Ligand binder design. Structure first.
Ligand code: CLA
Ligand code: CLA
Ligand code: CLA
Ligand code: CLA
Ligand code: CLA
Ligand code: CLA
Ligand code: CLA
Ligand code: KC2
Ligand code: KC2
Ligand code: KC2
Ligand code: KC2
Lengths: 172, 166, 172, 172, 172
């Protein structure tokens, strides 16, 4: 729990010293802050790659004649969703976030009690269940958090990432 | 705290006008000194690299199989326009291998920050006494600090259009 | 036994007082009724969602010359299966129900000895294979039992559900 | 490894005799005989099902110019395989058969050291991997061994079975 | 560690004599040498089979205008990958190889802390994940290492193997 996320090459890495003080709480806070940023960023780059590869759904998203094909890839997408779609995102994802399914308290050592079936194994593998798999998911987030800072600041110049791979790949 | 450290020397003495290491944190200081030596080692190669290219000295022959030669590639930021795209990826990547796999403390036996010998390449560091060992570190730091302002000039002045070179 | 079923955010929820006996024996039987309406309504909503997506088989269903596309979506579908087809549901399901393979003997901890393959079984995670996964299937049923009472009443007042979704979705 | 196969609603069912000898050494051999006829009949019936469904491969089978569609459905298929292909069935299967990866000779509880999704060795359910899933496959063989005695006599009329189903299904 | 690999019908089989030194420290190194040549040859033969089945990707590979269909089957494929692609092989594989994730160096029983279907570390059977499934993969390499010595010599005089198989298969 403490010894987690500090595997090689960097080890424990508090460069500026913001967990230089003590408590479990602000290390508790910043961990599940980091994990939830991890979990969200990982599905957002996999959400990015499956959008930008041309994998869509046929049919209109509403009465508008807005298809899923008419919704373009990239950052015009989430904005050009119709509003009543986004308020039904905030209803469901909202209820799923706070309330249904995925408890969020203070970062409770988030266990969520599901995972699979034969997989969580304490009583079988005390270094596979935590300290490796629980370490990688942190880092796969640490890649993907650095993927979306990437994903925005690339697309801030005109070609996006399907468009950015037909023209220029070089920097400004 | 760190007034007696390396790089504190005449005429300025210990010099921290921002008070950045005024808290006395060794680990913050060890980072900054490592960050200081690292830019210095780059800038010492960067100015000599800039001056020898501006003198016209190139590697012989072609940079790729399409016939693009080294002599066509100018000095400065305009070099990156004519180095081919496969070249610019390796120049970025191979230095990242030096960042990841080579130029760091791999083994944990470094006597200080920026000692990258790793028990592998040593040219006789222990043949210097402790005052010469301190002196050669003080030269490398201050040749480093000089070249950081030196290369920062030679990059700003390429963009200003006002040359500092004959 | 007891110590299963509902859960956060309800726990033991018998608010009208139908089971407040203090007797397990009446609670045993109504549990396995709920398991069965659990299991059936779950395969009827996913049956409903796959029938409504236009996911059909090719070819005629008989020498009546009814294709699988001819049989309409919604409530009419099971009703206008040919009668000899409805006997053969009965002949097969009825064998499958009352005695073979599923035996519902008397409502008995219908355990049926179909326990996944590795996954979700004893001599592994304690929390999961029972007191959670045994609880979710029941609550999965609790969603789908309410899904059909909906679905029937959605079909009762309007046409079928795909014809409920191209026109009005608001109430009467 | 004695209490194999039969079960409710039969149990030990040896209605004619020749097995109630009181010695299991003959019961021993016939049990592994039932397993192997089990294993062969089960992949022959599903082979019969997948051949009949129109599921074939593209291309010619050989220099003959016989496609995978050219070989008829039903009994005649294995007989009019070109002879050199039947030798290579014999070369590969017989090396796999009398010798190894399967090694059958001696004939009981070879076990083959091979599990399914390799689920169900041991240190799991000791009641599901033994006495039950061991019992189904043999009983699964019991259904499929009956399936072929049928299938050959179904084909014996003079068509294949897809040409038994488009015309008459009633008895002679 | 010592009882591993070969098996019926050979057992320990060192016929010429290089390894019967009495010291396992050299037997140690060559074992993990055989594992890695095992692992590489097995993905190269199935790479060779999937490349030859016509299974390619759509689109050009690069600015060259080389499609995934343009790159010929067989030996010449890896040789005429454009150079900057062969570095990005050397980039990513060489990062993945020496240390980082697969960490090979030192060169014996690295173990890599990866499971198949998270199946079979331990705390199941102790007879198949050691001494059998660990034995097959090495032997699976023993088939595939011979498969490429073949494959190169099959390609050496003849064209690519899909053009070995439409003309003559017999020896020179
Ligand atoms: C950060 C998460 C995230 C966000 C904000 C979006 C946002 C969006 N996705 Mg998306 N997607 C995601 C993850 C995400 N995706 C993942 C992980 C997958 C793979 C399972 C997909 C697969 C996917 C497809 C196949 C399509 C979209 C589409 C869309 C756009 C229309 C809204 C919609 O129907 O969503 C649908 C959301 C999902 C199907 C998956 C939600 C995933 C999480 C786990 C719940 C919208 C901008 C559509 C579009 O306009 O294409 C460009 C479309 O056709 N998404
Ligand atoms: C920060 C340092 C730096 C950087 C970014 C560059 C960058 C570049 N140089 Mg360059 N160069 C440098 C220093 C540098 N140089 C130095 C110090 C010299 C003097 C020897 C040269 C001499 C030089 C010539 C003669 C030419 C270039 C050229 C080029 C361009 C094409 C790449 C190439 O062929 O490089 C070639 C690089 C070299 C020949 C020398 C690089 C030496 C590096 C700095 C070694 C440092 C790391 C090393 C592995 C340390 C290990 C020590 C440890 C094991 C103990 C590219 C823009 C070419 C061009 O077109 O110019 C416009 C060209 O023809 N360079
Ligand atoms: C198929 C019918 C059915 C049956 C027999 C049961 C049986 C049971 N449920 Mg249950 N349940 C069902 C459907 C069913 N459930 C559905 C559809 C939901 C979703 C809302 C739930 C949600 C639910 C919760 C949240 C809990 C139970 C619990 C229980 C147990 C205690 C008794 C109880 O709550 O009242 C049994 C009720 C009846 C037998 C009702 C008689 C039929 C009525 C009068 C018809 C009314 C129709 C109605 C208007 C339609 C709307 C008992 C084993 C408790 C439990 O598991 O405790 C640990 C519990 O806490 N149930
Ligand atoms: C209680 C649930 C329920 C009920 C009453 C029905 C009833 C029906 N289904 Mg259906 N179905 C179900 C569940 C159900 N299904 C499920 C769970 C699936 C997903 C596997 C399907 C997938 C399905 C398809 C793909 C098709 C039907 C079709 C039909 C109709 C013709 C009979 C037939 O071929 O059944 C098929 C039954 C199954 C495949 C699953 C049960 C075994 C009939 C009204 C056909 C039709 O004409 O649609 C109206 C048709 O093409 N069903
Ligand atoms: C391939 C031929 C074959 C052989 C050698 C055996 C051999 C045996 N059967 Mg068996 N059996 C077969 C086919 C065969 N069975 C078929 C096709 C059926 C389907 C009706 C059965 C159904 C069957 C039952 C129902 C029972 C046996 C039982 C037995 C054992 C007495 C003996 C080992 C008995 C057994 O396993 O008792 C424990 C038993 O009760 N057999
Ligand atoms: C005892 C079982 C058995 C027997 C004798 C055969 C025999 C045959 N099969 Mg078959 N098959 C079987 C099981 C069997 N199969 C099973 C279990 C499957 C599912 C994996 C298949 C799937 C299959 C396909 C997809 C095809 C055959 C075909 C064939 C014929 C050509 C040989 C070949 O390519 O294979 C041959 C008569 C080919 C053919 O022409 O069909 C008759 C063909 O295209 N088989
Ligand atoms: C040692 C193994 C190896 C090597 C050297 C290559 C090398 C190559 N593959 Mg390949 N591949 C491999 C394993 C390998 N692959 C495996 C294991 C698979 C299955 C997942 C594939 C599936 C595959 C596809 C589907 C395609 C390639 C393609 C390519 C070429 C680009 C390049 C020559 C592409 C190509 O043009 O084929 C030559 C292409 O479309 N490969
Ligand atoms: C978080 C995933 C998600 C869930 C779990 C979920 C559940 C339900 C449920 C029942 C439980 C109903 C009954 C329902 C009904 C409608 N949803 Mg839906 N819904 C999902 C999310 C979105 C988004 C992004 C959009 C959307 C839409 C519609 C429209 C058509 C309106 C119209 O065209 O008139 C209708 C009727 C689109 C929209 O709002 O269009 C303006 C649109 O963008 N939904 N939705
Ligand atoms: C419970 C699922 C189920 C099972 C286990 C099952 C087994 C068999 C077997 C045994 C192996 C045979 C030989 C067989 C043959 C036929 N089935 Mg099938 N069958 C199943 C379900 C249905 C439904 C639901 C229908 C149906 C039909 C037909 C017709 C053509 C009749 C005709 O054209 O007159 C024929 C010949 C349709 C029908 O009866 O139409 C009047 C119709 O709705 N079946 N069926
Ligand atoms: C037991 C499954 C099985 C295995 C393990 C296996 C292995 C190999 C290998 C070794 C890797 C080669 C190189 C090879 C090549 C050919 N096989 Mg194949 N083969 C399998 C089975 C069959 C059947 C069942 C037939 C068949 C045929 C051909 C023909 C064309 C000959 C021709 O056109 O004259 C050629 C060239 C057909 C045939 O012999 O036609 C007369 C035919 O029925 N094979 N086969
Ligand atoms: C080891 C597997 C592998 C990894 C991990 C990886 C990573 C990345 C990343 C990092 C995320 C980017 C951004 C990227 C982009 C490009 N890759 Mg890709 N790449 C992979 C392998 C190959 C091969 C094997 C080739 C190749 C190519 C290209 C070309 C077009 C160049 C051009 O048209 O000039 C572009 C733009 C081809 C090529 O170099 O053409 C000369 C070619 O053969 N790549 N690649």
């Amino acid at each position: 729990e403490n010894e987690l996320g500090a595997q090689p090459p960097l080890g424990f890495f508090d460069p500026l010293g913001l967990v230089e003080d003590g408590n479990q709480a602000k290390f508790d806070r910043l961990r599940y802050v980091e994990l939830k940023h991890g979990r969200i960023s990982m599905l957002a780059v996999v959400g990015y790659l499956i959008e930008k590869a041309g994998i869509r759904l046929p049919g209109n998203i509403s009465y508008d004649g807005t298809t899923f094909a008419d919704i373009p890839d990239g950052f015009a997408a989430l904005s050009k969703i119709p509003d009543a779609g986004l308020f039904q995102l905030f209803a469901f994802i909202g209820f799923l976030e706070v309330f249904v399914m995925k408890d969020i308290t203070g970062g409770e050592f988030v266990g969520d009690f599901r995972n699979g079936f034969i997989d969580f194994g304490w009583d079988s593998f005390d270094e596979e269940t935590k300290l490796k798999k629980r370490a990688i998911e942190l880092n796969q987030g640490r890649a993907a958090m650095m993927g979306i800072l990437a994903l925005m600041v690339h697309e801030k110049l005109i070609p996006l990432g399907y468009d950015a791979d037909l023209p220029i790949i070089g920097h400004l | 705290a760190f007034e007696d450290e390396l790089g504190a020397q005449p005429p300025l003495g210990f010099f921290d006008p921002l008070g950045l290491v005024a808290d006395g944190d060794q680990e913050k200081f060890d980072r900054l000194r490592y960050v200081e030596i690292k830019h210095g080692r780059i800038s010492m190669l960067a100015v000599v690299g800039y001056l020898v290219q501006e003198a016209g000295v190139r590697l012989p022959g072609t940079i790729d199989y399409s016939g693009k030669t080294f002599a066509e590639i100018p000095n400065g930021f305009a070099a990156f326009k004519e180095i081919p795209a496969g070249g610019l990826v390796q120049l970025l990547f191979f230095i990242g291998v030096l960042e990841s796999s080579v130029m760091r403390d791999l083994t944990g036996e470094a006597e200080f920050v920026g000692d990258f010998r790793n028990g592998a390449i040593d040219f006789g560091w222990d043949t210097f006494d402790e005052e010469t060992q301190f002196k050669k570190r003080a030269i490398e730091l201050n040749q480093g600090r000089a070249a950081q302002m030196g290369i920062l000039a030679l990059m700003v002045h390429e963009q200003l259009g006002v040359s500092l070179l004959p």
